[PDB]
Scaffold this active site. Structure first.
Site, PDB file in Angstrom:
ATOM      1  N   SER A   1       0.840  -1.250   0.000  1.00 40.40           N
ATOM      2  CA  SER A   1       0.000   0.000   0.000  1.00 40.40           C
ATOM      3  C   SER A   1       0.852   1.268   0.000  1.00 40.40           C
ATOM      4  O   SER A   1       1.555   1.499  -0.979  1.00 40.40           O
ATOM      5  CB  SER A   1      -1.111   0.011   1.055  1.00 40.40           C
ATOM      6  OG  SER A   1      -0.668   0.098   2.397  1.00 40.40           O
TER       7      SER A   1
ATOM      8  N   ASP B   1     -10.213  -5.902  -6.518  1.00 39.51           N
ATOM      9  CA  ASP B   1     -11.018  -4.786  -5.957  1.00 39.51           C
ATOM     10  C   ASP B   1     -10.870  -3.559  -6.857  1.00 39.51           C
ATOM     11  O   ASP B   1     -10.221  -3.648  -7.900  1.00 39.51           O
ATOM     12  CB  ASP B   1     -10.664  -4.564  -4.491  1.00 39.51           C
ATOM     13  CG  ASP B   1      -9.334  -3.889  -4.224  1.00 39.51           C
ATOM     14  OD1 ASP B   1      -8.639  -3.495  -5.210  1.00 39.51           O
ATOM     15  OD2 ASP B   1      -9.033  -3.713  -3.009  1.00 39.51           O
TER      16      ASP B   1
ATOM     17  N   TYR C   1      -7.188  -7.599  -0.416  1.00 41.73           N
ATOM     18  CA  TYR C   1      -5.911  -7.067   0.123  1.00 41.73           C
ATOM     19  C   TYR C   1      -5.554  -7.721   1.463  1.00 41.73           C
ATOM     20  O   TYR C   1      -4.386  -8.119   1.648  1.00 41.73           O
ATOM     21  CB  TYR C   1      -6.014  -5.549   0.235  1.00 41.73           C
ATOM     22  CG  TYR C   1      -5.001  -4.944   1.172  1.00 41.73           C
ATOM     23  CD1 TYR C   1      -3.707  -4.671   0.756  1.00 41.73           C
ATOM     24  CD2 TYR C   1      -5.328  -4.684   2.488  1.00 41.73           C
ATOM     25  CE1 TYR C   1      -2.778  -4.083   1.607  1.00 41.73           C
ATOM     26  CE2 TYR C   1      -4.414  -4.112   3.352  1.00 41.73           C
ATOM     27  CZ  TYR C   1      -3.130  -3.831   2.919  1.00 41.73           C
ATOM     28  OH  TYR C   1      -2.231  -3.302   3.801  1.00 41.73           O
TER      29      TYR C   1
END
Lengths: 315, 315
Positions: free
Chosen positions: A165, A261, A292
């Site tokens: 991320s 996603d 995730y």
């Protein structure tokens, strides 16, 4: 009065007060961890404001040299720690799997320390790692900051970055930087980098959920409120008109990983830009039919398989 | 419902759940701390279950040897951490004042790990310190657990222990142990020990306050519920009929310190027993006209003066 609220993880008040409830617990240093079959870790100072958790797998031969992973944790630029269980438990598992030394950087968090602080802290940690090349153990007589584990075991021909991320955003910016500011003046080069679920903001043709359009984007303004160009700053939008050439990445192997996603569309635009740039090297993609969070649930089959797929890149 | 309620610090539930009052915050490793004019610290593993924070004062000569302080924090056997601000801020100040290397042990807390776990963890950390005597830096090629700062800078002729409250109780038990189990088989001896506000239970001739007769005693039951002899176990009552001879302490210098509160009467009975025992060595007392808490407020003149008094013993 609040300017940012994402409970129970972070609350930012107008007067600058920050509340962090429900963070993962601290895990202290350990030698020969039973759960991983002998991983060890320690926490070392790099500067007055940077530190890192250093990991060694079980050593079977004192004269062996290992790949080196420099790891930058994710969670919004504003949460968690290299020393807390959420990321620490993940790192010790990839150390055991890849049989690699790891350096998990403790960089300063936003909003108390806005970007670019985290970028510079990660760069300073990487330079500190690279400063060990060619040292012998005798250097420790006079260099209080240098690490015997890195001197003894690190293979500088197999240096890797790894981020998830916002940590993968730090990896991106670090790779651009390493093409312009060579590590240790050029004495060290990055072999490869893993970017899992990279945090980028790029305009898609697809309608996004409110979560994706607002909450997901809000971390950039929280971390870097003064960023030139806002959400189109090149350090968040790597495809911006003024953005540095991706062909300048200072490594020769990349693993880009995404999940099923709404961020996948953004990561695909990033990959398209990387391929169009003409960057020279090996570009691998791990496109998971998972969410995730499933990577970090470390006693599940799904997590083991996702982590094995990423760790297989560390050669 | 609760088996222990020791306000405002800790509640232990019948179902085994532990609720602690919000602790002081974690402080990461740092190199060249500005506030102390250059103290550095790192967190190192000693075993799978023991770790420590190692401190170095500002080094002005690479061939200098320093006194070494092994420190066991207090707070009830059940609270706080070597890595959290309350004790860490105190330790870095005495490192700067004494110009000493310090090893601040992270021992297992009660009630999750009842005594004698903390005593054994502290002993193992002290043995680990002592295991460095005579090593040179080349040892680090093959010994992953050994510390370059201790090899470079520790003077094993000037080894000290230091503890406060329950940590000072650990010092007492450690000093008895070091007379029977010599450190590193007798290759290392403790020069001195500081015991500030030691946690002992010795029967005064008159009952004291409600606090001293009840809540003060409850920390022992919480930490060691199955202690043979209960509150008269020799590890808490060093005057008990079956207790080890205080003349057997494995050191040659002691500083016993207390403050102007009711615990003083117990500490005086301990000092009387030590003097009656005939222990051979230098016995110093720092009897402060202050309260316990005033030592640890590190931005105040009173704390500076109290800590200066204690640190003056480290020679």
């Amino acid at each position: 009065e609040t300017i940012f609220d994402l409970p129970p993880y972070i609350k930012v008040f107008k007067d600058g007060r920050v509340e962090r409830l429900h963070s993962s617990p601290y895990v202290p240093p350990s030698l020969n961890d039973p759960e991983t079959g002998g991983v060890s870790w320690k926490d070392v100072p790099i500067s007055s404001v940077v530190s890192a958790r250093i990991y060694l797998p079980k050593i079977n031969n004192h004269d062996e040299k290992l790949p080196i992973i420099v790891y930058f944790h994710g969670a919004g630029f504003c949460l968690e720690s290299a020393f807390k269980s959420f990321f620490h438990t993940y790192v010790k598992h990839f150390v055991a799997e890849a049989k690699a030394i790891a350096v998990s950087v403790e960089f300063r968090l936003a909003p108390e320390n806005h970007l670019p602080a985290a970028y510079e802290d990660c760069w300073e940690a990487l330079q500190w790692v690279a400063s060990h090349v060619g040292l012998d153990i005798s250097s420790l007589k006079t260099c209080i900051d240098k690490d015997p584990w890195i001197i003894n075991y690190a293979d500088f021909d197999r240096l890797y970055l790894w981020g998830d991320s916002t940590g993968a955003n730090i990896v991106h910016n670090t790779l651009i930087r390493s093409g312009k500011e060579k590590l240790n003046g050029g004495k060290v080069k990055i072999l490869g980098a893993i970017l899992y679920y990279p945090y980028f903001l790029i305009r898609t043709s697809s309608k996004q959920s409110d979560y994706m359009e607002n909450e997901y984007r809000s971390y950039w303004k929280l971390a870097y409120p003064d960023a030139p160009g806002g959400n189109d700053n090149p350090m968040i939008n790597p495809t911006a008109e003024n953005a540095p050439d991706l062909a300048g990445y200072g490594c020769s192997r990349l693993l880009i990983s995404m999940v099923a996603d709404e961020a996948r569309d953004i990561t695909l635009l990033y990959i398209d830009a990387l391929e169009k740039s003409g960057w020279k090297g090996e570009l691998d993609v791990a496109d998971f039919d998972k969410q995730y969070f499933e990577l970090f649930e470390m006693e599940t089959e799904v997590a083991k398989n996702m982590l094995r797929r990423l760790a297989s890149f560390i050669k």
